[PDB]
Symmetry: C2
Subunit: 132 residues, 2 copies
């Protein structure tokens, strides 16, 4: 019973939070193919915000994560029914616009983990310095 | 022909450079088991330097890398012949004390990649600010 799962994102400065999310997507069912979609620099910058790494770098890193079976790079910014058919996608994984995916039985929620991000790490490096 | 490969390191703030190294270790031969050794906080701090993440965090991240088959956490700081026998290790992978491993045919060099480290990334974030 092989289920195709799709999860998209920026995946900037990949950290344990992304990886835990991807692991969840990948294990939603016993036998899955996890496709990860990586947003383009330009669309990311225009709609969301600043991105630190380019497309190439953000995709190169995802290639090394064990849960990831396939990468669409760059991926469309907005997910569409014709995209789901094109790639034979059974479910979309995202944390919680998705009304139509829920209505179709094709939405599966995953959870973020707080406090594990790469920006959090520098904060830690920096708290080694008394303000005086 | 399954070859057991051992690579050890701190793996602090894991980045594309570590992952490329681990991929190299893993692909040294057609069929391998890659064991990764993760140094303890205390020994790392005493001999090498400051570590940002704890043992648990540094190991949790390595679990998500696809090349990694087994983790020894914490691992011994110095590699010894009796360690190689205990874990049935055919080769040690490290970048380039290793005299005895070379003399025994059990050393396999891997290469680091410069400029891809997580500290490099913050430098990039920061160069978004003119000094004036």
């Amino acid at each position: 019973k092989n289920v195709v799962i799709y999860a998209d994102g920026v995946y900037d400065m990949l950290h344990l939070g992304h990886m835990k999310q991807l692991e969840q997507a990948k294990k939603l069912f016993e036998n899955t193919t996890l496709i990860v979609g990586v947003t383009s620099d330009n669309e990311t910058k225009l709609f969301k915000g600043q991105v630190v790494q380019t497309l190439e770098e953000r995709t190169e890193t995802l290639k090394h994560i064990r849960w990831v079976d396939e990468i669409i790079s760059p991926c469309p910014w907005v997910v569409t029914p014709e995209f789901l058919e094109k790639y034979k996608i059974d479910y979309v994984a995202h944390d919680d616009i998705y009304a139509w995916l829920k209505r179709a039985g094709k939405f599966k929620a995953t959870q973020r983990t707080e406090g594990v991000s790469t920006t959090d790490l520098i904060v830690r490096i920096l708290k080694n310095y008394e303000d005086y």
